[PDB]
Point group: C2
Chain length 324, copies 2
């Protein structure tokens, strides 16, 4: 019996023991395309749709300060890679995500600035700890645990709102220099949690594919029921090699996560029991700290579109990536 590490709150900072991967350098034509996107969203006269769902050319609103802070160098790069470096597609996708973010109630970088999705709104959804932000894996990705066997609410739109909220918070926890997350999915049934319309799948799929490009860096799956397990194993080789590498179906998590960063349930050193009244306020306060820092940094650098997340999340006095 090993000696585990007590923990009941999210790990605030990436430990120094985990290095941040180096970014792939951009070809000449890629930089040129990047500059066009930068130019498009730097336009002082830019106006975008008030929603995605009900978008109209005749109902537009110029960018808010908070939207400029979201429109980062890496945001541009995520969409460029998602759209396979097609300039018009990149611009439209970004535009539509801005549009969706206003509609959904998350365009203001936090409830502190007017977001309608609040911590208090979705807190009940996390009551049984069905989603947990905790730790960092080998490539400095923040970890999001998903535990559908701990489901505590009935299907509703609020489930989607919680889903999006937790995604935004795990993004708040990104270390400077990283912009993708790791999903750790535990499919076990937990009877300890009492089990309680339109299936939310379609909306969640639309949200993940359309508004969260290039965010899934790793997905680790464990405690898979037999039929699902068999299915996943039968199809794994037929999955495209570059997607295949991102997906791990029932292998030890310890090979992708350092032990002191991993829950002991899955072979790690962390002794974690979800305690809502302790965990939830810690996550909310920690996420808020990160956002305050990020936004202060953004204003200190001119409050312009195109700033780097490396700089906005970092602490160096001078910009590592100055804006053209």
């Amino acid at each position: 019996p090993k000696n585990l590490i007590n923990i009941d709150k999210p790990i605030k900072e990436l430990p120094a023991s985990i290095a941040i991967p180096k970014e792939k350098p951009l070809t000449g034509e890629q930089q040129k395309m990047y500059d066009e996107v930068l130019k498009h969203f730097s336009n002082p006269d830019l106006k975008v749709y008030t929603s995605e769902k009900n978008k109209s050319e005749d109902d537009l609103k110029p960018l808010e300060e908070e939207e400029k802070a979201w429109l980062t160098r890496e945001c541009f790069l995520r969409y460029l890679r998602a759209t396979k470096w097609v300039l018009k597609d990149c611009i439209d996708r970004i535009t539509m995500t801005l549009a969706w973010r206003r509609e959904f109630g998350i365009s203001h970088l936090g409830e502190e600035h007017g977001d309608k999705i609040t911590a208090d709104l979705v807190a009940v959804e996390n009551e049984s700890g069905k989603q947990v932000i905790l730790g960092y894996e080998n490539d400095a990705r923040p970890i999001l645990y998903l535990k559908p066997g701990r489901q505590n609410t009935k299907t509703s739109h609020r489930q989607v709102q919680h889903l999006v909220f937790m995604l935004e918070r795990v993004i708040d926890f990104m270390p400077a220099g990283q912009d993708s997350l790791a999903l750790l999915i535990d499919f076990k049934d937990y009877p300890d949690v009492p089990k309680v319309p339109i299936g939310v799948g379609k909306e969640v799929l639309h949200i993940l594919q359309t508004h969260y490009p290039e965010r899934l860096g790793k997905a680790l799956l464990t405690n898979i029921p037999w039929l699902a397990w068999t299915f996943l194993k039968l199809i794994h080789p037929f999955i495209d090699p570059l997607t295949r590498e991102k997906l791990v179906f029932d292998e030890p998590f310890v090979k992708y996560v350092p032990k002191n960063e991993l829950d002991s349930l899955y072979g790690g050193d962390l002794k974690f029991k979800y305690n809502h009244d302790v965990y939830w306020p810690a996550l909310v306060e920690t996420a808020r700290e990160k956002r305050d820092h990020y936004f202060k940094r953004f204003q200190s650098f001119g409050g312009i579109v195109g700033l780097s997340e490396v700089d906005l999340r970092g602490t160096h006095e001078k910009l590592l990536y100055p804006v053209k």
Copy 2:
């Protein structure tokens, strides 16, 4: 307006409204390898391992009559396609499936010839209708429904025995000219079935399907998928290899792939089917037995040799369509 067709038993014969897809005839170089497989398994002094798991060169037994009946032209082709037309792999794979069939208790083509896996042994596993053999789809494949939400037993080796048994029964239902099946999987939870409150069967089942049932899954239709799995299956769908992707259908109407008169009404068909074990099960057992009897007597009438075709063994024409070299 809705007028459904009453049914409570397996449909015995492919309707004539469904064509059997034409086989792609063998090339010149493929025939050559095939003949080598036939020659190997035609050897009258051939001896095979008595099990896969505990295989030994010093524990061998000759081919039984019933095993020669299993060693068909199409059996050879299934392995040839599976092993990418590598002769040594093909022969070895076939050999190990024969060995596993003996080990597992299904080497005799039915309990009537001494199979330890019997209808009575596994019947309790089907009591709530978690697996149902019923109907034929657009390409004449017999349909096997999987309904994991109706699980009625505790995890055990018997569950594997039942899975194999049902697979073997759906193969008995192959129309002459077809050798792949269609899986219709409904993931919905049926609370009306009492759920039992212990090693997972996945590793064994995976090994069995991959190693011992090559080229059997012609089609899988998935429906009533919970949101999370649904999103996953959609998120990964395009990244699946094309030839495998068209094989898999994730939450699309079954009516595109199955004629309505061959399809359960619950999935948009015209068959009003309610699973009644004391009616369904005996009828499944009887019909499969009839099909096996016909298959085996046909085998005997054509010489009782290795390499006969399933088209002839399941068919009724007086002359062989595939005489053996």
